[PDB]
């Protein structure tokens with residue numbers, strides 16, 4: 001089965017790069033939303049708001 | 050992960066890996082892996 005795959009190796013290069021493109025796109029989607037601030041703010045111990 | 054030692058301190062990471070841990074080249078100097086700093 002692998003010998004006949006060389007005739008369609010260019011197809012699998014497109015598909016592997018597509019899923020790699022999806023995976024990096026899904027990864028950067030979280031940083032584009034949750035990672036807006038570079039500093040982490042600690043909740044003050046006083047809860048009198 | 051093989052070829053990169055693990056260090057308990059946390060810095061800002063540049064090369065993402067997954068599951069909250071990255072890899073970077075810091076201090077000679079060698080490739081280290083650490084949990085990313087938010």
Ligand SMILES: *[C@@H]1O[C@H](CO)[C@@H](O)[C@H](O)[C@H]1NC(C)=O
Nearest residue numbers: 054055056057058059082083
């Ligand atoms: C990092 O420091 C913690 C502090 O207790 C220690 O438990 C841990 O073993 C240290 N890790 C390394 C790789 O030295």
